[PDB]
């Protein structure tokens, strides 16, 4: 039922490694019976029920049963479960390729879209036919058979290379050893929460709760150099070999399909349409931010010159890779009086979580309720149920996995677990999402204290959660966040603006000790500190965007050389020789291949909606919040990205709001 919750969450997380392998073989045999039945039908006999609806019913049944198998590799603490889950991801990723390359299925769906009356079906069914046929053409199903087996052969190799690329990073346990003197200027709440060795030295891992606090506050330059070296050489040996195979294979499968490069292949399925416009968007944005980067580099270089003179170090005259985070933090403390170590005392995890939910309970008109005794994959994971405030309709659920552990996903992402689409029996599926982040842990007898940049990630990742649950379509491929890759970052990056409002920050803040709020002067300086270090921060994002476009344009190109090239050209900070950032670039194998520009591309749309609709009528206005929910979040992938923007903005988007929010034109 749409107003109940019992039984709508069929995901179980207590599967043994043997049960996963058994459930995988059963899922393949059951799903193949559906595809084989459609393939064994007459071309003049296919109808909407035995062909389109039959495939739509198994796609919802498959992606849900698949999620129970490919997800434990990212969260489970048992390594055998993570290993068995990976062998199911490899097994099923090659199975999806085998089912997509079926010529008999493609011959029958083109017959429906060319012979049947398209007026007797829903508009999402017509979009289902066009998108299903277009994906068949993007797999070479309209090409000779000897080149289909060649494309099917290479895509199965690309499937295993992308899984191994992230499996190496997820299982990386590389760590360094330092002494108390080598960890200068670091607070005692961080030093005392580290593993001590036999010779009284400390152990520091290469994950976010350990790497960033060191690179932002350690005064010892040699300690920051070793951490930067070890962090950018994670899986350097094995992931470089994968890039030596994956990138040539990506350009080879694109040339067989008629595309010049792999970048041109994936850009057709995005809102940017062409790669010539992407490189034009990045190069023109890099010019407006070039003078800003020069001012920040000169100020940072002066800070390094004075500190080396005051401490007695050897000033080399350049900004190294390990010096960037340490002196950008000093720019934040001197020009805006923002001490991140002091501000985190006002952002405990419980108060931030409560304030975050209450902010969107009133904005989007929803109701959140934690479920006691939750069946989860780890005891530190909480479950919440989302209802519609006005109608009591149970929209969906979502998990909260906020603290890092062994074998956990070491970045910050949101995984769609169940799509909010229709079932064969006419009912609606309960959408399930999962928020996975690596926030700070309770130390020094205090609750988890979050830095302000950790609250943004909490607000960003919750954007994908609301987009997953509020999206309600008819087919599983259009449900959730399954939209244009350069557009999925619109709902998530837009919620970050609520972390820079003076009134909303008071609803998120409460000192962990005396319960007092943040001082008025500090709150004003915090909002004014939005554009601090905005030059080098965006230039680094522009570099990663240009590297993604370059590595998918040129054929025989050294991945490490091209990253170091754009660093000295755009960012101005040279890449450390011997490192390899693309070897740790998990986005190259996580669906963002050639599409990393979407992080800056989607920001142009979010700022244009926040300034033209929200900032005018009020960022807490339920009228604009409901319009945003129904026109952007609810359609999901059932509509084009620009169509949903045109329905909300009542016009075409522009960079006017995006530029003035960055201090530019």
């Amino acid at each position: 039922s749409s107003y109940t919750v019992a039984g709508r969450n069929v995901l179980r997380w207590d599967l043994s490694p043997e049960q996963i392998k058994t459930r995988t073989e059963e899922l393949i045999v059951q799903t193949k019976q559906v595809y084989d039945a459609v393939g064994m039908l007459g071309i003049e006999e296919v109808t909407y029920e035995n062909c389109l609806q039959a495939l739509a019913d198994v796609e919802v049944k498959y992606i849900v049963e698949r999620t129970m198998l490919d997800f434990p590799q990212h969260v489970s603490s048992d390594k055998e479960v993570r290993a068995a889950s990976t062998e199911a991801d490899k097994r099923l990723s090659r199975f999806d390729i085998e089912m997509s390359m079926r010529g008999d299925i493609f011959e029958r769906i083109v017959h429906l879209q060319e012979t049947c009356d398209l007026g007797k079906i829903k508009p999402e069914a017509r979009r289902y036919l066009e998108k299903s046929i277009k994906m068949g053409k993007r797999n070479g199903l309209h090409l000779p058979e000897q080149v289909q087996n060649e494309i099917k052969s290479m895509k199965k190799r690309m499937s295993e290379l992308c899984i191994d690329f992230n499996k190496n990073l997820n299982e990386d346990d590389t760590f360094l050893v330092f002494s108390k003197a080598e960890l200068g200027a670091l607070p005692d709440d961080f030093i005392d929460s580290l593993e001590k060795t036999d010779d009284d030295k400390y152990k520091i891992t290469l994950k976010y709760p350990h790497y960033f606090p060191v690179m932002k506050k350690c005064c010892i330059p040699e300690t920051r150099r070793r951490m930067e070296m070890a962090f950018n050489t994670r899986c350097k040996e094995e992931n470089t070999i994968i890039l030596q195979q994956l990138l040539p294979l990506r350009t080879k499968v694109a040339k067989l399909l008629g595309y010049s490069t792999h970048a041109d292949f994936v850009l057709e399925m995005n809102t940017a349409k062409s790669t010539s416009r992407v490189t034009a968007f990045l190069d023109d944005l890099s010019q407006k931010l070039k003078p800003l980067g020069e001012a920040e580099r000169e100020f940072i270089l002066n800070l390094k010159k004075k500190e080396c003179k005051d401490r007695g170090f050897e000033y080399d005259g350049k900004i190294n890779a390990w010096d960037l985070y340490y002196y950008m933090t000093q720019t934040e403390e001197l020009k805006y009086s923002i001490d991140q170590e002091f501000l985190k005392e006002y952002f405990p995890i419980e108060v931030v979580t409560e304030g975050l939910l209450n902010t969107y309970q009133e904005l989007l008109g929803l109701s959140f309720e934690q479920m006691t005794d939750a069946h989860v994959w780890n005891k530190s994971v909480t479950l919440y149920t989302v209802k519609d405030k006005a109608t009591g309709e149970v929209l969906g659920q979502f998990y909260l996995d906020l603290y890092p552990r062994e074998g956990k996903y070491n970045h910050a992402a949101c995984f769609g677990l169940q799509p909010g689409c229709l079932l064969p029996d006419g009912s609606r599926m309960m959408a399930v999402a999962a928020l996975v982040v690596n926030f700070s842990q309770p130390v020094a007898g205090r609750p988890s204290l979050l830095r302000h940049d950790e609250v943004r990630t909490y607000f960003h990742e919750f954007g994908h959660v609301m987009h997953q649950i509020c999206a309600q379509t008819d087919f599983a491929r259009f449900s959730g966040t399954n939209v244009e890759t350069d557009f999925v970052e619109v709902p998530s990056q837009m919620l970050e603006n609520w972390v820079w409002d003076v009134d909303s920050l008071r609803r998120l803040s409460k000192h962990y000790k005396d319960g007092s709020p943040i001082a008025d002067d500090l709150l004003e300086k915090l909002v004014a500190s939005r554009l601090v270090n905005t030059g080098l921060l965006t230039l680094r994002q522009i570099v990663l965007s240009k590297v993604d476009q370059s590595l998918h344009t040129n054929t025989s190109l050294d991945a490490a050389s091209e990253y170091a090239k754009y660093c000295s050209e755009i960012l101005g900070v040279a890449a450390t020789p011997g490192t390899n950032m693309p070897a740790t670039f998990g986005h190259l194998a996580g669906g963002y291949d050639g599409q990393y520009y979407g992080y800056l591309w989607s920001e142009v749309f979010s700022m244009d909606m926040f300034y033209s609709c929200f900032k005018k009528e009020g960022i807490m206005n339920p009228e604009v919040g409901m319009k945003y929910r129904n026109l952007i979040l609810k359609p999901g992938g059932s509509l084009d990205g620009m169509d949903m923007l045109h329905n909300f903005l009542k016009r075409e988007p522009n960079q006017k709001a995006f530029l003035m929010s960055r201090g530019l034109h």
């Binding site: 910050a412 990742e461 990056q493 990393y596």
Partner: peptide, 4 residues
């Protein structure tokens, strides 16, 4: 989100 993006690589920090």
């Amino acid at each position: 989100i993006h690589p920090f």
